[PDB]
From a paper:
The [name] calcium uniporter ([name]) is responsible for [name] calcium uptake and homeostasis. [name] consists of two conserved transmembrane helices (TMs) connected by a 9‐aa linker with a four‐residue “DIME” motif flanked by an N‐terminal domain (NTD) and C‐terminal domain located within the [name] matrix 11, 12, 13. [name] NTD appears to be essential for the regulation of [name] Ca2+ uptake through interaction with regulator(s) and/or modulation of post‐translational modifications.
The T4 lysozyme fusion was used to enhance solubility and to phase a new crystal structure using molecular replacement. We also determined the structure of an extended version of the [name] NTD ([name] NTD‐E), corresponding to residues 75–185, without the T4 lysozyme fusion at a 1.50 Å resolution. Superposition of the two structures revealed a root mean square deviation (RMSD) of 0.29 Å for 90 Cα atoms. This surface and C‐terminus tail (174ATLNNVKTL182) were predicted as potential protein–protein interaction (PPI) interfaces by the InterProSurf analysis 32 and the consensus Protein–Protein Interaction Site Predictor (cons‐PPISP) server 33. The C‐terminal tail in [name] NTD‐E forms an extended coil structure and contains K180, a known ubiquitination and biotinylation site 25, 26. Of interest, we observed an unidentified electron density, which is predicted as a linear lipid‐like molecule with 13–16 carbon atoms and modelled with a tetraethylene glycol molecule. The lipid‐like molecule interacts with the residues in the L1 loop, two helices (α2 and α3) and C‐terminus tail.
Residue numbers in the entry: 74 to 182
Amino acid sequence: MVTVVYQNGLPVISVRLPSRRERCQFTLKPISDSVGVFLRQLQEEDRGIDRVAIYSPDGVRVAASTGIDLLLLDDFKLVINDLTYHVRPPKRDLLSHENAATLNDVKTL
């Protein structure tokens, strides 16, 4: 199964990759990473991947330029080679992401 879990305010997507026995996790920046960034990371991780794509639950291809914040507003399908994974991210506000991974009362100069 492909899962999405927020850790320190950022989405961590855990994926079974075809060449690998063990799961691998991908942490993404919702406000600046795109669908295409994530798909490129998958391909870089496993040379056994010949095809990767993301689709809406209704089966419509999602544009590579789409922000990860927008992707994670709802369910989606992740195709890796000949397997399609139904991904169910946890719901949170689109506004949620603007203070992600910030430590309260410590600012960097």
